[PDB]
């Protein structure tokens, strides 16, 4: 009689708990950092002078006439863009772990440029969107990347060409977060589209809509796993930065996924379909 | 890093009834404090056709509507009608004399105007006049439904600051009226003009009924439930501070405050012009203007409430400048409010955790990241037996200022509870806490009200 | 006296232009819809829910992004020759996208600096472009791979309305890539050596080549993508009553510095 | 499109002498209005070395300096000395006790400050204190030379091949209340330092002598020559943006007479068109600024100009045109013009040859005039530059009385007003050139503080 009152019943989370991975890597910085003054206001201004010398590198920062780098600038063409009498090696803590917004910004820029140089075998960097994407090798050609997921060897088609023409590249925003007195790299996966592996796609918005279909838990988690492998391996003249995975996060209650796969008419929607 | 999974926050309903779900809670207990003979007089503006459509929809709602998805009945409940199982314990009636039509000629006059901004101003002019008349006359509506015909919604609303937004301008031009408006699509009765329309717009009827009636109930000034507090003595007030940018003049930014109580009622203040860090971007307040805004807000709160709060929590989506923390501290000190907290709510953090499987982590998952707090306000919801969305949820990152009295665990539970204050829907898994969510809605309206003109603090006018 | 060329081409616009309303605020919002339909082209504008183009939008996949009932052919002068800022903006956007479409064989367009440049064909490969200077067949190495950085001949193509006509303005420059396609990560090094090429004869020569390309782009050829709807015309030389006594080559010790040296 | 090649504008020098060239003119005729026993007292701030260096240069200048390029003699002339062939008919002397020295230790104190902005403020504090001492004591300099040692210049001035304080702009703002202008020089070559970025690593001596003395002459308040034409004033209206606060823009006016003297005024904050950009004035604020400018001119000159030409580098908004008209009406000014001077037009003409078109080349496009302020110069027998010159595009407003041909000639003539050098082929007309210079200084003077109208203090 009338409209039935539901009891408001539901299956609770499992009390056994479960684990989750976080998309951070701990960064191990060199113990010392080099600082100096420069005649150049910013790094862009110093580039023409820098490239007059050989063995060019760009993992350095000049802002407000101040230079920073992890490498010794006296041993590279940077020796032309600094005031040499002011070059000093100091405890990295004095630049990377203080309260000055300017040192914080210069630290993050140096970390970002260091990662770019360290990963250049696999990755290309776009100034727009600050996006790091797997680079194509060959025009209109797909390629795969092999990597370890726990104890299992796996692979992904990180550059994927389609023709009736566009090419999709696995991508990530790599951000930096300081938590207490440690720096972390944050992996936020995305995709980048080109027409042929190289030329940026003239109108992303068509393709932007297909990315959303892929934003599903298992697919994003797999991509995090793959980037953590790339970046950890990148740190093994030695690479300047090493990266360390964090222990899993333990959650006291678990999603009841196996029950829901049975009861939830929308279960299949939670899984990415790559069209 | 230590993780928690918070309980879904409990709401309190009529006679001290508690439930996590607004819809089940209202059916079990009714709203927070009904009075015998409660009635909400609903005025209507539409065409002959859409007004008739609204009449039929209200009648159908009154009889009740069956769920269109019985396999997920908690998320898709039946609407129990407005008779002996009325969950609002309130009549919703369109009185005779309280309907205004838009004629065929007026529709054609608007659609016929080729320039978008011209067409929008003509529409706002006409409708704001019709609203003023309905409010000024003898019909005495508590809330007005604007049900425009589909071709007029198609003209006024773009599909998916160059161009006028019809809704935002209308709300601005009607901000001085005490009777709020609910703008609806006349076929399905969901909200129109708040977001872009779908070019191919083409069951969830009981949900649409729940949502429209809940919206009208809030707009009539009635409270369906309150956040259940830890202590019945320890009242907390929640103040968001936001900024919006003017399009005219020098494009200066203006501060705003959104001051909420545990019953989900909001007070809206406009404060001083903001300073900016660099090239007219990154707005912030000086110590003096931050103090003044918090003093203004506390004053408004006291004017509308019996009890002074024991705790005030201030939320801002950008970091607290030292000068802001200084001025807020100065206003708090002088207020004599015992406890206070300042929390930066990052809405765009890249940090996330990922369980192993296809469903995302539960709503209420929290990770304490050494003084930063990662909180999933969206995610798998046990009550609903699913994750109600599609795209993976991205959590909030909460950064409590060192000036705060509470722990990051207490402040995260507060944020999660504030997500349940919801004027848009009866589904409780919203991403943003009400004071932050309110900032963007009020900013889009207030940019159309000249700086220095007094604006109403009654948040219902902005919804 | 002597004669000088001006870096303008007169633009010949169709007598009619199509206007409509659109459900979409701007062209970028319409793209996902437009490409779902096919028979696509991009030489059109939507801005503030108004659509403009020279082609009839009913005849292409653009039919999905206009309000069909409102499509109207109107006298070009109503959009292209008034003092309404919005109309002058939309006109320049339509001209630019038309040029883009008409020159797609040779040129790529860069959003940044609104720069056109000769596109590469092979990765890390050089190519030449054959054109007419006066009545003489010539060639320019418009893509030059140095072995690694690639320089592409480029130009800022701008629009100027003088009295009651439209003109395309050719402002030559150079674009640098790593491979022929990927923009140069740090291009300040190379930009520096563009300045050495900023000399009268070298720039004049570039004006000439660009003129050729743009005039040709508007040519209707028998037995040859839709035909172009815009044409371009060279202007008469400018007549100067007083001439530079260049034959200074004797007396000025800096005469040679006036000629460009490409390195 | 009709072209015209203007004649190089004529200047008037002493006793009715006329010449196109500031240098040849002064050589033959002397300056506009000399008085017997004219002397400029030059104060000096530097180190023991630079002060000694500068006093030798001054002495050497007096004896005369030979051209180091007789193949281009008009371009590279001889400086004929400060005796019987003195082009300035003026003595230039450093009086006793008009010298202040910076110690080697003071230099090291600045160059060793590691943060650029701290170094700059420290240098500014130190030097502005020495300037104040010099002005407030008994030496009575007319003009002060600041000859900083090379290492201090290298510290203070950024190298090239809003993020940071500019030493010269900040020093000038901090000293704008002083009535004795400063000239900042490199102590090796005596050319201008700190106006522009320096080269990463550091002979036209007679030209250097001409340029320095001409600058001191102007800063000492003396007039070398007048533009040969009732009196016309030329008022530039510009805008600069503040770095702090809300980064508002402020209007400025730079009003020049035909003797090349400038009066500088600060007006209301500007409105902007979009997202803090495209500054413009409302009608009333435009009227106020022009009324303020005419008031300053009248207060000095006890007359009002018969013709006012107003120049801007952005289009005149209708509100701006309205306010300017209202101001002219109230000031009873009879004839006026409004010209938008486009500095970055892509329109250009190309002769057949290696040399560019002649300076003074003008093309009337319909309603807009292409003008070459830089290009091949017959008098110099070359094009003095390297990169091909890009012309100005002049757009007269419909509210103007004069024709575009008359207006273009005025713009060309205004390029000869030159407080920087004695070479006359300048790209911009003085009222426009002054806008950027004054804006860079005034952004360091808090809005609301009244500033001197004396343009010499901003040069
Ligand atoms: Cl970079
Ligand atoms: Cl701060
Ligand atoms: Cl585009």
The domains of chain A are located at 18-30+122-270
In a domain, D5, yes or no: no
Residue whose token pair is 């009529």: B14
Contacts of B38 (CB under 8 A, 6+ apart): B88, B89, B90, B91, B222
The CA B324 to ligand 2 mean position distance, Å, reads 8
The ligand minimizing its distance to the Cα of A113 is: 1
| C neighbour chains, 3+ CB pairs within 8 Å | A, B, D
Residues near D347 by beta carbon (within 8 Å), at least 6 away in sequence: C6, C7, C8, C160, C169, D365, D370, D391, D393
The three-class DSSP label of residue D117 is helix
B250 lies in a domain? Answer: yes
> Of B219, B247, B267, which residue sits at a domain end?
B219
- Which sign, positive or negative, has the C-alpha torsion D113, D114, D119, D121? negative
Q: Would the CB atoms of B275 and D162 count as touching at under 8 Å?
A: no
The partner residue sitting opposite D71, judged by closest CB among C160, C198, C251, is C251
For C256, residues 6+ apart whose C-beta sits below 8 A from its C-beta are none
Distance CA D6, CA D20 (A): 12
**D354: Cβ contacts below 8 Å, ≥ 6 apart:** C199, C200, C201, C246, C255, C258, C259
> How are beta strands D307-312 and D335-342 bridged, if at all?
parallel
How many angstroms separate the CA atoms of B401 and B241, rounded?
15
Mutate which: C1, C2, C4, vs D, most D CBs within 10 A: C4
The pair phi, psi for residue C195, each rounded to 5°, is -65, -35
Rounded to an integer, what distance in angstroms lies between the CA atom of residue D399 and that of residue D443?
A: 32
In a domain, D358, yes or no: yes
How is residue C126 written in tokens? Answer: 């050089």
> CA-to-CA distance for D190 and D46, rounded, in angstroms?
13
E strand or H helix that includes residue B417: helix B408-418
Q: Tell me, yes or no, whether D4 lies in a domain.
A: no
- Nominal resolution in Å? 1.5
Pairing status of strand B339-346 against strand B353-355: unpaired
- Report helix, strand or coil for D270: coil
First to last CA, chain D: 39
Contact C123, C181 (CB under 8 A): yes
Does the beta-carbon distance from B385 to A11 stay under 8 Å?
A: yes
Q: Residue D68 has what DSSP assignment? A: S
Residue of B nearest to C30 (CA): B160
Q: In terms of Cα–Cα distance, which of B125, B123, B148, B142 is closest to B51? A: B148
Question: Apex CA D74: angle with CA D70 and CA D75, to 5°?
Answer: 85
Q: Is-contact B94 B55, C-beta < 8 A?
A: yes
Could you give the number of structural domains in chain B?
2
Residues D377 and D453 in one domain: yes
CB B362 within 8 A of CB B376: yes
Residues D124 and D71 in one domain: yes
B136 and B171 assigned to the same domain: yes
Same domain membership, residue B408 and residue B272 = yes
Helix (H, G, I), strand (E, B) or coil at D92: strand
CB atoms within 10 A of CB B4: 18
- DSSP 8-class letter at D74: T
Interfacial residues of A (vs C; Cβ cutoff 8 Å): 44-45, 47-48, 51, 58, 124-125, 139, 196, 198-199, 203, 205-206, 208-209
Answer yes or no: do D41 and D150 share one domain. yes
Residues with Cβ within 8 Å of C120's Cβ and at least 6 positions away in sequence, in order, are C127, C143, C150, C152, C177, C179, C180, C181
Instruction: With respect to residue D25, please indicate whether it lies within any of the assigned structural domains.
Output: no
Cβ-based contacts of D5 with chain C (< 8 Å): 240-242
CATH number of the domain where residue B304 is located: 3.30.420.10
Question: Nearest-CA neighbor of D417 among D182, D224, D237?
Answer: D224
Q: Domain check: are B141 and B193 in the same one?
A: yes
Query: What is each CA distance from B55 to B50, B58, B147, in whole angstroms?
Result: 9, 5, 11
Domain final position from B166, B194, B219: B219
Are B350 and B311 in contact by the 8 Å Cβ rule? The answer is no
Residue at a domain's end among D200, D219, D238: D219
- Alpha-carbon distance B57 to B64, whole Å? 10
Q: How far apart are CA B283 and CA B273, in angstroms?
A: 9
Residues B237 and B193 in one domain: no
Domain membership flag for residue B244:
yes
C247 vs D: CB within 8 A = no
Residues D64 and D180 in one domain: yes
How far apart are alpha carbons D271 and D252 in whole angstroms?
A: 13
CA–CA separation, B182 and A81 (whole Å): 64
Residue D418 has which token pair? Answer: 């030159």
Whether residue B211 is found in the same domain as residue B252: no
Q: Taking the alpha carbons of B207, B209, B213, B216 in that order, is the dihedral positive or negative?
A: positive
Instruction: Count the alpha carbons within 13 Å of B259 in the hemisphere toward its beta carbon.
Output: 26
CA–CA dist C42, C30 (Å, integer):
11
Whether the CB-CB separation of B120 and B157 falls below 8 Å is answered with: no
Cβ contact C21–B114 (<8 Å): yes
Q: Is residue B247 part of a domain?
A: yes
Contact C32 A199 (CB under 8 A): no
Does residue B337 sit in helix, strand or coil? coil
Mutation target vs C (from D197, D354, D374; most C CBs, 10 A cutoff) = D354
The residue segments making up the domain with residue B131 are 34-219
CA separation, residue C142 to residues B42, C135, C147 (Å): 71, 20, 16
Chain B residues closer than 8 Å to D245 by CB: 275-276
B117 Cα to the center of ligand 1, angstroms: 41
Contact B279 D162 (CB under 8 A): yes
**In degrees to the nearest 10, what's the CA dihedral of A77, A78, A82, A83?**
-50
Strand B339-346 vs strand B396-400: parallel, antiparallel, or unpaired? antiparallel
Tell whether B206 and B238 lie within a shared domain: no
Q: Let me know whether B201 and B157 are in one domain.
A: yes
Cα of B239 vs centre of ligand 2, distance in Å, is 20
C-beta atoms surrounding D52 within 10 Å: 14
Query: Is residue B279 assigned to a domain?
Result: yes
Cross-chain CB nearest to B199 (options C25, C26, C33): C33
Report angle CA A77, A78, A84 to the nearest 5 degrees: 115
D90 and D146 within one domain = yes
């Amino acid at each position: 009689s009338g409209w039935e009152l539901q009891p408001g019943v539901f299956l609770p989370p499992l009390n056994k708990g479960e684990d989750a991975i976080i998309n951070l890597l701990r960064i191990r910085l060199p113990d010392e950092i080099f600082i100096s003054t420069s005649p150049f206001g910013s790094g862009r201004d110093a580039v023409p002078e820098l490239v007059k010398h050989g063995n060019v590198r760009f993992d350095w920062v000049i802002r407000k006439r101040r230079f920073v780098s992890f490498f010794d600038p006296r041993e590279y063409g940077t020796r032309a863009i600094v005031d040499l009498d002011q070059v000093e090696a100091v405890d990295t803590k004095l630049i990377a772990f203080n309260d000055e917004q300017d040192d914080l910004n210069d630290t993050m820029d140096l970390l970002r440029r260091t990662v770019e140089r360290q990963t250049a075998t696999q990755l290309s960097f776009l100034r727009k969107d600050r996006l790091f994407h797997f680079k194509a090798v060959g025009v209109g050609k797909s390629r795969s990347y092999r990597y370890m997921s726990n104890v299992n060897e796996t692979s992904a088609k990180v550059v994927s060409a389609y023709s009736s023409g566009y090419v999709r590249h696995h991508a990530a925003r790599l951000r930096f977060e300081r938590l207490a007195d440690e720096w972390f790299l944050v992996i936020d996966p995305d995709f980048h589209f080109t027409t042929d592996g190289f030329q940026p796609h003239r109108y992303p918005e068509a393709l932007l809509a297909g990315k959303k279909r892929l934003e599903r838990n298992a697919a994003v988690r797999g991509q995090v796993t793959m980037w953590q492998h790339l970046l950890v391996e990148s740190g093994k003249p030695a690479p300047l930065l090493q990266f360390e995975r964090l222990p899993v996060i333990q959650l006291s209650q678990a999603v009841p996924e196996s029950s829901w796969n049975r009861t939830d008419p929308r279960a299949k929607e939670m899984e990415a379909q790559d069209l | 890093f230590k993780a928690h999974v918070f309980d879904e926050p409990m709401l309190e309903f009529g006679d001290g009834g508690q439930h996590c779900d607004p819809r089940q809670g209202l059916r079990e207990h009714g709203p927070l404090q009904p009075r015998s003979g409660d009635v909400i007089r609903v005025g209507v503006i539409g065409t002959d056709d859409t007004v008739a459509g609204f009449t039929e929809f209200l009648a159908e709602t009154g009889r009740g509507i069956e769920s269109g998805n019985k396999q997920l009945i908690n998320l898709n409940p039946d609407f129990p009608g407005l008779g002996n199982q009325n969950p609002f314990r309130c009549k919703f009636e369109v009185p005779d004399g309280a309907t205004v039509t838009i004629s065929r000629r007026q529709v054609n006059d608007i659609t016929g105007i080729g320039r978008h901004d011209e067409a929008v101003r003509h529409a706002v002019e006409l409708i704001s006049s019709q609203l003023s008349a309905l409010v000024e006359g003898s019909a005495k509506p508590d809330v007005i439904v604007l049900a425009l015909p589909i071709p007029l919604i198609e003209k006024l609303v773009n599909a998916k600051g160059d161009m006028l937004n019809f809704r935002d301008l209308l709300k601005a031009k009607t901000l001085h009226l005490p009777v709020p408006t609910q703008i609806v699509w006349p076929d399905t009765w969901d909200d129109a003009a708040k977001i872009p329309r779908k070019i191919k717009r083409d069951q969830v009827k009981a949900t649409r009924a729940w949502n429209l009636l809940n919206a009208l109930f809030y707009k009539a000034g009635k409270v369906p439930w309150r956040l259940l507090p830890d202590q019945a003595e320890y009242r907390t007030s929640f103040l968001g501070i936001g900024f919006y940018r003017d399009l005219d003049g020098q494009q200066l930014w203006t501060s705003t405050a959104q001051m909420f109580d545990e019953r989900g009622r909001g007070l809206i203040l406009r404060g001083a012009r903001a300073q900016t860090e660099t090239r007219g971007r990154h707005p912030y307040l000086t110590a003096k203007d931050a103090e003044d805004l918090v003093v203004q807000s506390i004053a408004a709160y006291k004017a509308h409430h019996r009890h002074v709060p024991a705790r005030l929590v201030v939320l801002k989506t950008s970091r607290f400048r030292s000068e802001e923390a200084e001025g807020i501290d100065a206003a708090l000190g002088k207020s004599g409010i015992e406890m206070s907290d300042l929390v930066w709510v990052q809405e765009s953090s890249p940090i996330a955790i990922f369980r192993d499987g296809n469903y995302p982590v539960l709503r209420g998952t929290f990770v304490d990241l050494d003084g930063k707090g990662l909180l999933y306000t969206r995610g798998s919801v046990p009550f609903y037996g699913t994750f109600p969305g599609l795209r993976v949820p991205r959590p909030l990152l909460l950064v409590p200022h060192e000036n705060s009295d509470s722990t990051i665990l207490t402040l995260a539970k507060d944020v999660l509870a504030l997500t349940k204050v919801n004027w848009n829907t009866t589904q409780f898994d919203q991403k943003l806490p009400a004071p932050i969510k309110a900032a963007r809605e009020v900013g889009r309206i207030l940019k159309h009200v000249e700086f220095g003109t007094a604006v109403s603090s009654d948040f219902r006018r902005y919804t």
